Design an enzyme around this catalytic site. Structure first.
Site, PDB file in Angstrom:
ATOM      1  N   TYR A 155     -25.532  17.554 125.293  1.00 33.08           N
ATOM      2  CA  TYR A 155     -25.606  16.144 124.937  1.00 33.08           C
ATOM      3  C   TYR A 155     -25.733  15.214 126.156  1.00 33.08           C
ATOM      4  O   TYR A 155     -26.610  14.345 126.198  1.00 33.08           O
ATOM      5  CB  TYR A 155     -24.423  15.746 124.055  1.00 33.08           C
ATOM      6  CG  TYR A 155     -24.497  14.291 123.661  1.00 33.08           C
ATOM      7  CD1 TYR A 155     -25.369  13.865 122.663  1.00 33.08           C
ATOM      8  CD2 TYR A 155     -23.742  13.340 124.330  1.00 33.08           C
ATOM      9  CE1 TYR A 155     -25.461  12.518 122.322  1.00 33.08           C
ATOM     10  CE2 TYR A 155     -23.837  12.003 124.010  1.00 33.08           C
ATOM     11  CZ  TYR A 155     -24.689  11.601 123.005  1.00 33.08           C
ATOM     12  OH  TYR A 155     -24.750  10.265 122.700  1.00 33.08           O
ATOM     13  N   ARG A 160     -13.314   7.475 129.073  1.00 30.41           N
ATOM     14  CA  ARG A 160     -12.837   6.093 129.102  1.00 30.41           C
ATOM     15  C   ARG A 160     -12.874   5.450 127.725  1.00 30.41           C
ATOM     16  O   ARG A 160     -11.969   4.701 127.350  1.00 30.41           O
ATOM     17  CB  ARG A 160     -13.697   5.244 130.043  1.00 30.41           C
ATOM     18  CG  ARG A 160     -13.087   3.883 130.326  1.00 30.41           C
ATOM     19  CD  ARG A 160     -14.044   2.940 131.030  1.00 30.41           C
ATOM     20  NE  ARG A 160     -15.241   2.746 130.219  1.00 30.41           N
ATOM     21  CZ  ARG A 160     -16.481   2.868 130.678  1.00 30.41           C
ATOM     22  NH1 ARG A 160     -16.687   3.159 131.956  1.00 30.41           N
ATOM     23  NH2 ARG A 160     -17.512   2.694 129.860  1.00 30.41           N
ATOM     24  N   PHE A 167     -27.695   2.049 145.198  1.00 33.97           N
ATOM     25  CA  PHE A 167     -27.990   2.231 143.794  1.00 33.97           C
ATOM     26  C   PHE A 167     -27.290   3.494 143.273  1.00 33.97           C
ATOM     27  O   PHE A 167     -26.695   3.464 142.199  1.00 33.97           O
ATOM     28  CB  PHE A 167     -29.516   2.269 143.589  1.00 33.97           C
ATOM     29  CG  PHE A 167     -29.941   2.680 142.194  1.00 33.97           C
ATOM     30  CD1 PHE A 167     -30.169   1.730 141.210  1.00 33.97           C
ATOM     31  CD2 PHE A 167     -30.073   4.021 141.863  1.00 33.97           C
ATOM     32  CE1 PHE A 167     -30.531   2.098 139.913  1.00 33.97           C
ATOM     33  CE2 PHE A 167     -30.417   4.400 140.580  1.00 33.97           C
ATOM     34  CZ  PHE A 167     -30.666   3.434 139.599  1.00 33.97           C
TER      35      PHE A 167
END
EC number: 2.5.1.21
Lengths: 323, 333, 334
Positions: B135, B182, B252
């Site tokens: 996934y 989270r 980044f």
């Protein structure tokens, strides 16, 4: 994946929550060499510290400690100190020491040899003069800065001029050490340890312990301020030492603790809590300058005119800002 | 062009998180990554929209990569907040077709592969940990791989960055897993499940039982097990970041990874994942004077968060040995 | 060495008394730039203090402003009649000019020229308020643009930066204009309390008949509107600021140039659509917190983040709202 190296890093994390992450971030061969240097230094410091070891037993341990690096079975099982695990499992540490390249062994053994003598010298006396304060700080901290610099250069990540400049590497250690000594007055009082130089403190009180009483607070802060002023004299050398560095991982390792000690001094300045209750990062040199200067101004603005060191404190900061 | 201006406006509206660092990228990467994010956002928005039947969604996900090539394709039936990217898809796809051909290959390949993977998951929850990895590959791993291939195609980074798809996949998986961990409570309020069933069912009957005040000990035990799983990606994250040579790319890539370990560090053994809110940040001593913009600082910042976790590992936690073990590996490498 | 210049020590003491903000970054400059910029800053502050002093009549003041660049070469010149907070730089001007005359002559030339030009412009504005936006640009050029120009010529003359840095006076000018416009916007209220008016009349008169009226609670909405128009004006300098910073190559100069600009952009963002600019305070307000302003891509990201902070806050209701969006869009464009 070596078992003993995994264990050495476990010990580094147990004993040095301050420095472990920056040590681990060091490039190539420095990482292991500095890890092992720290562990062996911690073992030596733990022996020095242990008041259950008689001076006559302790003198040979300190003198001969460098030689234990080459005795695969050597350990010490009789310590009652916080960091005793590094002594009890010293064979794991010394084995990894003996795995380092010879160039790094030579530097580490040399420093242990010299530190052992200096620590043994000061066991039965307190520091008296400021000159003696400097000598004791050389033995327990200045030598570490010298040893680190020699490791940086031996590795080739730093230029040979880094390891060559022993005077400023020494000031690096003097600065951190005096800072911790200043900050830790109360802790050390509680442990019957005396590190404030007698020739300074006895101009204020009869007994160093007197600075812990309410009625001597004003005198205590005057002496605090004198010692800080003394410590600030190392900053120009700190700045010159840091300015020579070319490796980012080294720069981070050296700069962050200096800046942290500078913040500590600024917070301690004229602060009676020393006796009771207590857009820039520091990874490029110009930024480190700027941060040091801001801290100097925090001190400068707090200088009381009545303080007997006030002119001297202004003078050293004025020197730092100007030159 | 007016269409490129509109794309940057959309990037800023839909990407609170990456918009600024994307716009700071050097040269050709800026536009290539801006477009990549917008089409990923469009695809994600189709996937998320529960008013789109499975009958219609399956072809939209499989076929999404092809819409990039079809100048007039748009989708007008979305009920999601980010729907403007779908309604004005022609503007985005025009800029896609304006990129160097080498960037188009990468972006389309990712969209193609992601759509297939997302369609595969429309029908099922995540069961095994291997399924969890799969996934996260589909929704995040492939984004890391796509981004890395863009950096290498642009030649601002070495070919290795694009070639080592395992390391790139690990960047995505680490972010994705942290986010999933989270977000237990927010995904409970939302009615779809991301924590792997083969892990949580060893503690409770349904995943929702973790929100109930009597199950806190088991909840935190599971939390800790999943954190431990995610920490296994850190060696690859350090390897990946340590190979970057371009400052704009470094910023980044590094910042979200640091933010992710910071989050896992705050979540570890923390009850507030389940019966409150986890506050990050705040004063970890030695790293307080480091920014995350050079590799040795990033190493130190990561190591320090690891120790924040290591210090909190209680002996009685079932994963406590495994958590110690992986951190010990990260330290010693 | 403790036998080197005590007068230079005093200069750095003054730099710290007078620049609560910039002293640390100026002191962090490499080589010859450190003292050149320190001394530039001090003589600029002295000039600014003369200009600021309302106890000196216009007739007395103009010749001081015009001749200030020559007082740099008058070893005993000082000014004893100021009552301004930073009057010590005027009273002990000989210590500062002594150190000025110790700089290499290439730097002296640059600083003298800027002081000369600044004096002329300051004197021009002594008897008029700023009317148009064109006049706003001109006043800002005189007191700040020229500073950016002079610094850039110091950078290039030192050889620490490319010769292009000092040559491109338009980009250097915009660096000064951006800071100065931000400061003028932020200080509406403190400037009202000291009777000097800096907001351009051609703008504010479209909202109230008297600039003082923006401090009246009944005109708070018109105030915020005019405010948004001025911020919008200042935002137009941002492309030049980015071009300017992108040319820098010396870390110490980069830090010195970027930090003030980033602070200014933060201020503009905290001020935008904020009525607190007229009532009280204005205290500066995730990715930004993880990077500091010390490499160019980080600075871009920081800037772009403050631009979104403004963007998402624009009221459709606002008369400049269209224009605010266009300029931000442009900033995002390159």
């Amino acid at each position: 994946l070596s078992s003993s190296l995994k264990t050495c890093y476990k010990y580094l994390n147990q004993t040095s929550r301050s420095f472990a992450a920056v040590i681990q971030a060091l490039d190539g061969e420095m990482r292991n060499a500095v890890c092992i240097f720290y562990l062996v230094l911690r073992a030596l410091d733990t022996l020095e510290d242990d008041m259950t070891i008689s001076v006559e037993k302790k003198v040979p341990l300190l003198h001969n400690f460098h030689s234990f690096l080459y005795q695969p079975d050597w350990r010490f099982m009789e310590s009652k100190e916080k960091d005793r695990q590094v002594l009890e499992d010293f064979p794991t540490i010394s084995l990894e020491f003996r795995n380092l390249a010879e160039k790094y062994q030579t530097v580490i053994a040399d420093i242990c040899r010299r530190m052992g003598i200096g620590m043994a010298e000061f066991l039965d006396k307190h520091v008296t003069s400021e000159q003696e304060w400097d000598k004791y700080c050389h033995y327990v901290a200045g030598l570490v800065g010298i040893g680190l610099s020699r490791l940086f250069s031996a590795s080739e990540f730093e230029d040979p001029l880094v390891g060559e400049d022993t005077e400023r590497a020494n000031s690096m250690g003097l600065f951190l050490q005096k800072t911790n000594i200043i900050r830790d007055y109360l802790e050390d009082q509680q442990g019957g340890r005396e590190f404030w130089p007698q020739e300074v403190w006895s101009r204020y009180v009869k007994k160093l312990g007197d600075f812990a009483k309410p009625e001597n607070i004003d005198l205590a802060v005057q002496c605090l301020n004198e010692l800080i002023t003394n410590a600030l004299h190392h900053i120009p050398d700190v700045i010159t030492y840091l300015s020579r560095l070319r490796n980012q991982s080294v720069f981070n390792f050296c700069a962050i603790p200096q800046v942290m000690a500078i913040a500590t001094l600024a917070a301690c300045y004229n602060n009676q809590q020393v006796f009771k209750g207590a857009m820039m990062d520091a990874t490029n040199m110009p930024a480190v300058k700027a941060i040091i200067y801001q801290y100097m101004e925090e001190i400068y603005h707090r200088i009381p005119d009545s303080d007997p060191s006030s002119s001297k404190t202004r003078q050293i900061i004025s020197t730092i800002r100007t030159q």
